[model samples]
Target: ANPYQRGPDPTESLLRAARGPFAVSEQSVSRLSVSGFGGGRIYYPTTTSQGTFGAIAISPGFTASWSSLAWLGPRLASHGFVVIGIETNTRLDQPDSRGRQLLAALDYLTQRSSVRNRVDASRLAVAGHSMGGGGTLEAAKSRTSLKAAIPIAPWNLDKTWPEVRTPTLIIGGELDSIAPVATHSIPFYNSLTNAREKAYLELNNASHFFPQFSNDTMAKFMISWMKRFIDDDTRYDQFLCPPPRAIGDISDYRDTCPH
Candidate 1:
């Protein structure tokens, strides 16, 4: 049996829903009460029977607060993970700085937060949007122990990512003028020469702020990627493997398939 597996076997319908099977609970971490990174919200499963869930620390884009990505907190937590949607020390912080703050947030979640008991310190991941998405790559590069990374419409100055070993999924917006797929997402995907596994999914007609809204396609893939890597659960493999077709909301999909 897969000891790390949580929730029922996945189905296309299950992942598309607004929320998952678990009841979620949330707690706020005030900036004045924490160190390293600015504080934000912690979302977790209300049940203790599932053992400790793997945790993910998420960051918002430059000039954005945790609230910008707040929807992800409870949405992901209800799917059986501990999620920390973080605030940067300063709104103007750059991607590399946001990346450091992401690591700091993970440290706080595992070592100092009130919900530390609900998190499995070893199984961790990082995700972010735009500059925060770029920071996701930075965090993954700096912390090899991270189980998964998802950078949504990520914007970063450094293109090459041969240094990242963690499995990663980079989501891009076909219409994103801020971080066009040609210059940002495509190149980043190409440069991830050493990732354990990687995938690039471009949303058709989407913009740079796509992550800021609630979209079913994005949520499904993000959940599957995290589950496949962080939980070491193969049940979610079907969603990723064979590569999703470039239809509907998906403009293009590329991956290290047949796992």
Candidate 2:
């Protein structure tokens, strides 16, 4: 069942704004700590509270660094998540290495007294771009405890994903030649019938580099999903419901979530 199950507040839906092709908001992003665990840059929220925050570890694609996903670290962190922009030991490492790295990064975050106690270590999510995206899928599958997985233009040698049990959101670039929508994203989504929840969003004419682009749409959906699953906040369920009538740069959208 969806976490947020409240009376459908009869207000006009925010799904339009939620799935934006709009500009990125100017939310203040926290400090970048290269000295942090996992050799990744840490972006945390400014406000301090007793409540534990949710943690998300982001992996970069092959030959890419934190710079490739620099925008996400700040964007998600500003919205109350402890986001880790990860770096790899070697740029040539594959999705399998990237997946393990994400779990290790989360473990590092959980071991720190300051950060671990401040964030719910059990409620963790993973995300990535390109090969890193495939890593997110693998990580979630490898660890059933993971709450969510968001794979943006994931690239993998294997297309049949029978191991995915975590709630997944697969984002694909419609015109992506590298990880062509037909060969990668579409087949990946189709194989996740057993996932607790699943969604697919295809960006029209978008390339595999779309995740690197600054757009409000991805942030809106990502934050909402994290809040709903990791934080178990019901307020975000409204955004998921009504099935988002086609808007934004998302050319096509589909989800297994009950309407």
Candidate 3:
């Protein structure tokens, strides 16, 4: 049996829903109370009976705060993971600094936070938007132990990523002028030669800030990728493999399929 699987059997409708099966709770981490990174909110499943859950630390885009991606916290936590929506030490911090802060947030989540006991330190992930998305790749490269990474509309100056070994799912906006798919997402995906597994999903008519809103497509794929990698829950594989055809909101989809 897969010891990591959580929640009921997944279905298309379930993954597309606004919330998942698990009830969620939230705790705020004040910046003054933490070190390394600015403090943020931690969202986790309320029930302790499920044992420890994998945790994901998320960083907002350059010049952005945790609230930009705040909707993702409880939405993802309800799907059975510890989700931390972090604020960078400074809004102007660059991607590399944001990346380090991401690692710091994970350290705080697993080692020093109030919900440390509820996290499976071994199972960890990172995600971000724009420069924060760039930071996601930075975090994954620096910390090879990370189980998964999702860089949404990621903006980074460095394009090559042959060093990242974690399973990664890069989501891009097809019409993103800020970090256009041609220059940013496509090149990044092409450069990830060492990723254990990888995928690229382009949202039709979407912009760089697509992740900032509550979109079912983003939530669905993010949940599946995390569950598949962090939790080793192959039950969610159905949504990934066969990679959802570019129909509806999806403009394009690519992956190292048949995993």
Candidate 4:
């Protein structure tokens, strides 16, 4: 299980330098209600009475849980960002209830004082893993709330993502055969429409599960992208490190493997 919990755990050590950016509180969250897009829980880890709040919509990989992103979620909070992991079934293959579920979750967050005060309604971003990664694009294209989308280890089908104009960030590992960037990332990045900005990051020697499978690249990418889209900071480098280039082959995999 991921060590990162939603907000801080009861017995965790506080960062010594963590004084005063946000209100000092041990993760007390309220269950805000949504006007029925779908009923699910939303967790906001920011103190509404204190600093500004930033929002992140995390759609986990297929068959995974919001808990899977538990590590990444709170890290964003500690940075003073209000991150919410949409509790959709990681299996977002058809992009059905998942998108609505995410929309409902976003609505729920926006209606909160902590989230409402801190989040930039105009600067929302979505991050997804595996099937959920592909679903992120579908969700962005389907709803206008998404200002940005990040599809990690995505599976692109029917070449349908070129129409997605929302700024998108694609992250993939060089390893992991399950959802190779050659099969998904490169193609999807290349195909996005006249997008505000499109980016592709290739993790050297990484795989489908590399970040989650190993280190914290996914979390880092989330933090950086959120800074760019949510906070609208120009200092944040939008220039891709290896920079966006059409390389590799993500189209080599079969979509039925997850089944």
TM-score of each: 0.99, 0.84, 0.99, 0.71
Model 3 / residue 213 / CA error / Å: 1.0
Model 4 TM-score, all chains together: 0.71
**Model 4, 118-230: lDDT tens per residue?**
56565566666776677777777777557778777776563457557676778877775877776777777777765577666677666677545424444554555555555
Write the number of the candidate with greater TM-score, choosing between 3 and 4: 3
Q: Write model 2 residue lDDT over 1-259, tens digit each, in one string.
A: 5432222321333422332221222222123432332376667655544245678889999898778888787667655677777887677778878888888778777774245665678788999998888889889878988888999999987676778788888888889999888998899899887788888878777888988877566666776677677777667767676557666677888877672
lDDT of 1 by residue, 99-211 (tens): 99999999999998898998999999999999998999999999998999999999999998888999999999999999898998899999999999999999999999988
In order of listing, the candidates' clash counts read 1, 1, 0, 15
Error of 3 at 155 (Å): 0.4
For model 3, the stretches where C-alpha displacement exceeds 4 angstroms are: none
Pick out the ten consecutive residues of candidate 1 with the lowest summed lDDT.
1-10
Model 3 lDDT-worst window of ten: 1-10
List model 3 lDDT by residue over 1-259, tens digit each. 8777899999989988889999999999999999999999999999989778999999999889899999999999999999998998999999899999999999999998999999999999999999999999999999999999999999999899988999999999999999998998999999999999999999999988899889999999999999999999999999999888899899999999987
lDDT of 4 at 19: 27
Better of 1 and 2 by TM-score: 1
What's model 3's TM-score? Answer: 0.99
Evaluated at residue 32, the lDDT of candidate 2 is 43
- Comparing 1 and 4 by TM-score, which wins? 1
